[PDB]
Amino acid sequence: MKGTFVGTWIKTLRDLYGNDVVDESLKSVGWEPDRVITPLEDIDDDEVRRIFAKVSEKTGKNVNEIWREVGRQNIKTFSEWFPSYFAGRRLVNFLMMMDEVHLQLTKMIKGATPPRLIAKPVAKDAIEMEYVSKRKMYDYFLGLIEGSSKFFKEEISVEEVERGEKDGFSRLKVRIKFKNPVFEY
Ligand code: HEM
Numbered sequence: 001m002k003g004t005f006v007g008t009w010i011k012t013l014r015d016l017y018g019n020d021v022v023d024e025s026l027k028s029v030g031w032e033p034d035r036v037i038t039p040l041e042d043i044d045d046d047e048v049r050r051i052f053a054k055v056s057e058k059t060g061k062n063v064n065e066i067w068r069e070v071g072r073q074n075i076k077t078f079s080e081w082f083p084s085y086f087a088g089r090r091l092v093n094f095l096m097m098m099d100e101v102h103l104q105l106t107k108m109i110k111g112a113t114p115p116r117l118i119a120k121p122v123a124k125d126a127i128e129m130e131y132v133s134k135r136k137m138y139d140y141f142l143g144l145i146e147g148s149s150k151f152f153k154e155e156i157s158v159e160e161v162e163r164g165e166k167d168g169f170s171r172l173k174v175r176i177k178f179k180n181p182v183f184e185y
Pocket of ligand 1: 001002078079082085098101102105106112113114115117133134135136137140141144145148
């Protein structure tokens with residue numbers, strides 16, 4: 001994962017559970033206590049999993065809920081970096097463009113494997129969206145949907161339809177229902 005993102009996640013872990021919890025977990029993975037996470041460096045996905053695991057211990061909270069909260073909080077940070085993706089958009093159109101955005105933002109990186117996030121309308125007030133990735137970050141994905149609903153102030157309900165791994169690709173399909181209709185007739 002790009003260090004940009006991992007560093008963002010660490011700050012949220014710090015902001016949520018405290019410098020003590022985080023600093024102890026960054027040492028159990030061998031990180032120097034003075035490490036500066038540059039943008040372009042790529043941090044190993046399993047090192048991040050270890051970090052999140054230690055924080056789950058040192059807090060008693062389930063690591064899925066930690067990932068969910070990190071997801072909810074990350075949307076705000078993305079609006080700081082990419083305000084054009086948020087400007088003038090409604091929630092449903094933001095969600096439907098995420099698949100394309102993740103392609104556009106990784107296509108200059110050799111060997112990038114961005115998650116697929118295809119969304120399609122299934123009713124006047126609902127869409128389906130399917131996460132597809134080697135990385136199996138189900139709760140991060142769910143948390144980002146929830147954070148998007150809070151950012152845009154459009155309430156939704158999320159129904160999980162299917163989850164599972166095929167080969168190495170994890171897949172999670174959800175049905176997102178908007179409390180008000182989002183389509184026109
Ligand atoms: C403007 C908002 C957003 C931006 C700019 C953005 C961008 C990115 C980028 C560049 C990555 C790294 C991909 C890679 O390294 O392969 C990523 C990771 C990820 N993105 Fe987003 N994202 C946004 C919102 C969302 C939303 C709304 C969702 C879900 C609906 C989502 C789902 C994910 C997941 C689950 C990952 C982790 C990688 C994985 O599971 O394979 N993102 N995001």
